[PDB]
Design a protein around this ligand. Structure first.
Ligand SMILES: [Mn+2]
Ligand SMILES: [Mn+2]
Ligand SMILES: [Mn+2]
Ligand SMILES: [Mn+2]
Ligand SMILES: [Mn+2]
Ligand SMILES: [Mn+2]
Ligand code: NA
Length: 325
DNA sequence: CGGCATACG
DNA sequence: CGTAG
DNA sequence: GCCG
């Protein structure tokens, strides 16, 4: 088992679901306390289990696996022996965890804002609604639409959104293309948001495109909220006899950068952090969603595909459906 | 022990 | 500070 | 919390 998640296939569904979910509770709780290091370790240990070819049945099977030390191994041992881990259950039913999770899941609210609200005694969404004076425009939108935004987005929803985005993009710039990214590109059947990457085959024609796209969507009455190259919107998606709010991200990249932006926006989050860590620490190259930089020769690697990028990093190619780290 | 990814709005 | 993957 |  390789030590970096970008070195191993990770499918969407796997053979250690319960174990990985428990470790990801502890990872999330570490984040709510600001312990980014512990969050990462628990996230990586969870992802190792997702990559295994069969169920862990015995503690012996953890020996030699990367990111399993005393703590993550104890968690697994208790779940193997009792079907529950007392630490995990204590986190689950703690008022701190429940409230931080409820608050941070609001669009516009991060750990730091949720933490300050928690320290102020706030616990519920209606607590936040009673003092709108204390909210940003973005948070007011996230709270107004919170119920819809908590409802799973389905693939049928995605196909309808993509057609309307393509129609606005085609008017903004003939020849521009729309690619579905994020978790749907990794094969998920449901999601909590939809992500699109927009480019044009003639380098430079994409400049100025996103304002033109947004203005057209707004004029069609489709934009419930928006605020450049990245747009974090809330779309009005028609539904049987009604509609629902859906989070949509629209991103523009020049075709020279498109492989890097595709790679980054396709995720997963952990996969991209691990890929960039691997790039820098093992290969001495600096990766982001714009490009891959050699800091010794001071040159950018030209890529025509994701396959190019994996090759330039010395990694076996992984299709999106195996990047579910 | 230091590191933990790296951007944009 | 928020957002993204 | 774990790795190197
Ligand atoms: Mn026991
Ligand atoms: Mn997404
Ligand atoms: Mn998104
Ligand atoms: Mn840019
Ligand atoms: Mn230390
Ligand atoms: Mn970037
Ligand atoms: Na949030």
């Amino acid at each position: 088992m390789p030590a970096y998640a970008c070195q191993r296939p990770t499918p969407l569904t796997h053979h250690n679901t319960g174990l990985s979910e428990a470790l990801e509770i502890l990872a999330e709780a570490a984040g709510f306390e600001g312990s980014e290091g512990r969050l990462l370790t628990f996230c990586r240990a969870a992802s190792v289990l997702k990559a295994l070819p069969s169920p862990v049945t015995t503690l012996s099977q953890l020996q030699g696996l990367p990111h399993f030390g005393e703590h993550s191994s104890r968690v697994v041992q208790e779940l193997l022996e009792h079907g529950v881990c007392e630490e995990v259950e204590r986190v689950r039913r703690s008022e701190r965890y429940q409230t931080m999770k409820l608050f941070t899941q609001i669009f516009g609210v991060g750990v730091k804002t949720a933490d300050r609200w928690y320290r102020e005694g706030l616990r519920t969404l209606d607590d936040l609604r009673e003092q709108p004076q204390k909210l940003t425009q973005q948070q007011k939108a996230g709270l107004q639409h919170h119920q819809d935004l908590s409802t799973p987005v389905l693939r049928s929803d995605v196909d309808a959104l993509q057609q309307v985005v393509e129609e606005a993009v085609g008017q903004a710039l003939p020849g521009a293309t729309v690619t579905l990214t994020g978790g749907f590109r990794r094969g998920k059947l449901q999601g909590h948001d939809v992500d699109f990457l927009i480019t044009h085959p003639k380098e430079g024609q994409e400049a100025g495109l996103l304002p033109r796209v947004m203005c057209r969507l707004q004029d069609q009455g489709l934009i419930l909220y928006h605020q450049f190259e990245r747009s974090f919107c809330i779309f009005r998606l028609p539904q049987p006899g009604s509609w629902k709010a859906v989070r949509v991200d629209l991103v523009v990249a020049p075709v020279s950068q498109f492989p890097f932006a595709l790679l980054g926006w396709t995720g997963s989050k952990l996969f991209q952090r691990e890929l960039r860590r691997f790039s820098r620490k093992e290969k001495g190259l600096w990766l982001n969603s714009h490009g891959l930089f050699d800091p010794e020769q001071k040159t950018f690697f030209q890529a025509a595909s994701e396959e190019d990028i994996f090759r330039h990093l010395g990694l076996e190619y992984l299709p999106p459906e195996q990047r579910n780290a």
